[PDB]
């Protein structure tokens, strides 16, 4: 993985040694080159994972998440450089450095063989993410958003550390390849019940599980655009990736331990989808939309079927592009009217015809129109949970209806109707913004032609 | 807020429109419209205003019982089939400010005339604001009525968004 | 219930402006200033070439040399055989039916 670690590290001297007016050009250009080389990780085999060294490996689960991570860095750079234009040069370079350091931790997190190494990197992502929100958010309550985000995580992550160290003592190793062969069944006991919860609750908070989700809308409303993009697209999936890995060593106890979380997820997805129908902050609506989509991922992971794991992988990738695109669309309006209130600026299709098309496409993928990979992932989960219990189709189907309702409600409210009379600063869409939207949706739709590369190891 | 005279006249018009929805045919409507008018002409000279209010209240109870459940609506009236149909084509005039210079070059005559209006607007604004200050009592406006211009060369205060509003059929 | 003299004067003043504004929305003669049966068959003949013949060439080439070269890609319902038919592949003759009772 050094061919990705080192050039990512070199982005830092590139940014600091660039001419003052070239920092965005150079960092964007070279981060795109790193993203191109990331496609060499597609050398996956049917039986064995791609095991580079004693520290790093890449299977079909981590590879799509790696590609998404390195694709997202140039997009965040493009999305950030406008609202940071007045920032002084050193603080701009520090901002870009946080984004680069976030990529560094993320690609190492997704490729670590040993689970303590994954833990340290998994925890290290907190620092630049917290700094990005509290330093470069606009509003007063970004400070509280940082503390909620920080302490929700550490409330779950410290028990995980204790469990991980306990598991190594008992088993002798935390190398994930070793765990596949030395794994032993988890028998029933109160000790194993708390081992299970310690192994899982940290990832539940990240997803976030319904009932542990209130940090997320708080974080999004305060974060700058790049913060929301990485948070929605990658940082949530750290918990999804963590669960997909650690469930290996939790059988058969997951059989009955999953129930309360499945109930929270299955009911939570309806609750959060309904909440979206009444949200007045556009960013908060997209944040609640993520909670609803990630509830499906949690169910998929917990029921542990080949179909559910494939759906979970596709849903995680598909949501990452879709939700990141929606924050970018929401942010493009915000950079004109300086408000996140959804009802403030209406009828924008009359004023911004092509941005209306991007809104339309983002909404269509959000409601999982066939054959977008959004639907492929959702459909696979719906398929698998029906076998788990046929009654789940009722909650799955109802959630589909509500998702279509709030997705299109977003579109109708902001883009259709009459334009607000007094808002007279809706300038034409910039090339940067149109490129940013298209750099989300085009790869997302191209993945329809070859979905297999996002379906994960169970494919 | 509405006078008694306004309430009776509103009811008469509303009653006649629903009667037409029922009758459909013009000859039938003419006949029953005249009968309806004769019911209003009967109590036209009622000077006891408590009695007059009783007449109107019963009349409105009668209307609610006898109204057409699907009355005719003019196509562009609120609730009609063409209401707001052309709103998507109405584009505010400030949007032309953002036109690219090559787009503006396609209409040199139009954009020179637009500059004269923008100059007329800029030079008039202070007098409009001053006229409204002088004519507004201490408490502020008590109604929404706006005044005319009082001198020569003055424009009626707050005219821009009335005068330059989109055409009803803008495209 | 008519207008008041101030209402009439304001409406008159606005009306004059609105009509002058509407008059000014008329384009000039030079606007926009822009930057610098045989026809039936030919237009129909070029359309048939580009939108039918070329597409069918491509599809036929694709079906013939890529799709039909793989098992079970184009599966036909086999032809119906009636009493009295002759099979082309083998020359077999299908016997007639038994003679009908009169009806």
């Amino acid at each position: 993985m050094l061919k990705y670690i080192i050039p990512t590290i070199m982005l830092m001297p590139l940014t600091w040694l660039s001419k003052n007016n070239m920092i965005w050009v150079n960092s964007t250009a070279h981060s795109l080159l790193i993203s191109f080389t990331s496609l060499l990780l597609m050398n996956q085999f049917g039986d064995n994972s791609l095991n580079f060294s004693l520290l790093f490996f890449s299977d079909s689960l981590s590879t799509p998440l790696l590609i998404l991570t390195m694709w997202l860095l140039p997009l965040m750079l493009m999305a950030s450089q406008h609202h940071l234009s007045k920032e002084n040069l050193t603080r701009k370079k520090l901002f870009i450095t946080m984004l680069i350091s976030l990529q560094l931790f993320l690609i190492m997190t997704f490729t670590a063989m040993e689970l303590i190494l994954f833990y340290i990197l998994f925890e290290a992502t907190l620092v630049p993410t917290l700094i990005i929100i509290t330093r470069w958010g606009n509003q007063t309550e970004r400070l509280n958003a940082g503390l909620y985000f920080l302490f929700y995580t550490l409330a779950g992550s410290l028990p995980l550390l204790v469990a991980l160290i306990y598991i190594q003592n008992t088993v002798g190793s935390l190398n994930f390849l070793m765990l596949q062969y030395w794994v032993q069944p988890v028998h029933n006991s109160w000790s194993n019940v708390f081992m299970w919860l310690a192994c899982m609750m940290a990832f539940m908070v990240k997803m976030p599980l319904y009932g542990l989700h209130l940090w997320l809308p708080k974080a999004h409303v305060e974060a700058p655009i790049a913060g929301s993009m990485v948070l929605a697209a990658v940082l949530l999936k750290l918990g999804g990736y963590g669960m997909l890995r650690i469930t290996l060593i939790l059988n058969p106890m997951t059989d009955f331990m999953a129930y309360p979380f499945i109930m929270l997820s299955l009911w939570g997805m309806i609750m959060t989808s309904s909440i979206c129908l009444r949200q007045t902050d556009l960013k908060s609506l997209i944040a609640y939309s993520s909670v609803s989509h990630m509830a499906l991922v949690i169910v998929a992971i917990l029921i542990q079927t080949p179909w559910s794991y494939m759906g979970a992988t596709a849903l995680m990738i598909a949501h990452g592009l879709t939700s990141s695109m929606l924050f970018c669309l929401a942010n493009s309006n915000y950079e004109r009217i300086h408000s996140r209130t959804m009802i403030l600026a209406r009828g924008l299709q009359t004023l911004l015809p092509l941005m209306a098309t991007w809104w339309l496409l983002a909404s269509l993928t959000n409601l999982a129109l066939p054959p977008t990979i959004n639907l492929i992932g959702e459909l696979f989960v719906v398929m698998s949970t029906f076998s788990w219990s046929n009654i789940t189709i009722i909650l799955m189907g109802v959630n589909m209806v509500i998702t279509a309702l709030y997705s299109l409600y977003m579109l109708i409210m902001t883009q259709r109707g009459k334009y607000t009379y007094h808002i007279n600063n809706i300038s034409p869409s910039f090339t940067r913004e149109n490129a940013l939207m298209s750099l989300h949706i085009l790869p997302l739709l191209l993945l329809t032609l070859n979905p297999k590369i996002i379906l994960g190891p169970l494919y | 807020y509405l006078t008694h005279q306004q309430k009776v006249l509103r009811l008469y018009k509303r009653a006649l429109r629903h009667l037409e929805s029922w009758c459909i045919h013009r000859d039938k409507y003419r006949y029953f419209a005249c009968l309806l008018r004769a019911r209003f002409d009967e109590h036209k000279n009622e000077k006891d205003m408590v009695k007059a209010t009783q007449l109107l209240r019963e009349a409105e109870e009668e209307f609610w019982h006898g109204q057409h459940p699907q009355p005719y609506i003019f196509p562009e009236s609120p609730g009609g089939t063409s209401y707001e149909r052309y709103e998507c084509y109405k584009v505010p005039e400030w949007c032309l400010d953002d036109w690219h210079p090559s787009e503006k070059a396609m209409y040199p005559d139009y954009f020179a005339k637009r500059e004269q209006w923008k100059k007329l607007r800029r030079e008039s604004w202070e007098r409009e604001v001053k006229q409204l200050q002088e004519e507004t009592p201490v408490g502020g406006p008590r109604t929404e009525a706006l005044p005319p211009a009082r001198k020569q060369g003055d424009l009626p205060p707050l005219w821009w968004h009335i005068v330059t509003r989109p055409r009803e059929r803008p495209m | 219930s008519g207008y008041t003299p101030e209402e009439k004067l304001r409406l008159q003043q606005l009306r004059e402006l609105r009509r002058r504004w509407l008059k000014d929305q008329e384009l000039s003669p030079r606007e926009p200033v822009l930057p610098p049966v045989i026809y039936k068959t030919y237009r129909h003949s070029i359309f048939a070439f580009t939108h039918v013949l070329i597409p069918v060439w491509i599809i036929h080439y694709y079906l013939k040399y890529h799709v039909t070269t793989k098992p079970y890609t184009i599966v036909e319902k086999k032809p119906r055989i009636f009493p009295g038919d002759t099979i082309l592949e083998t020359g077999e003759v299908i016997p007639p039916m038994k003679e009908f009772p009169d009806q």
Binding site: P353 | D98, P166 | E26
Partner: peptide, 12 residues
């Protein structure tokens, strides 16, 4: 008569 059609800029 031909009337100017007010629309948003399409150049961008």
């Amino acid at each position: 008569k031909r009337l100017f059609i007010i629309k948003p800029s399409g150049f961008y």
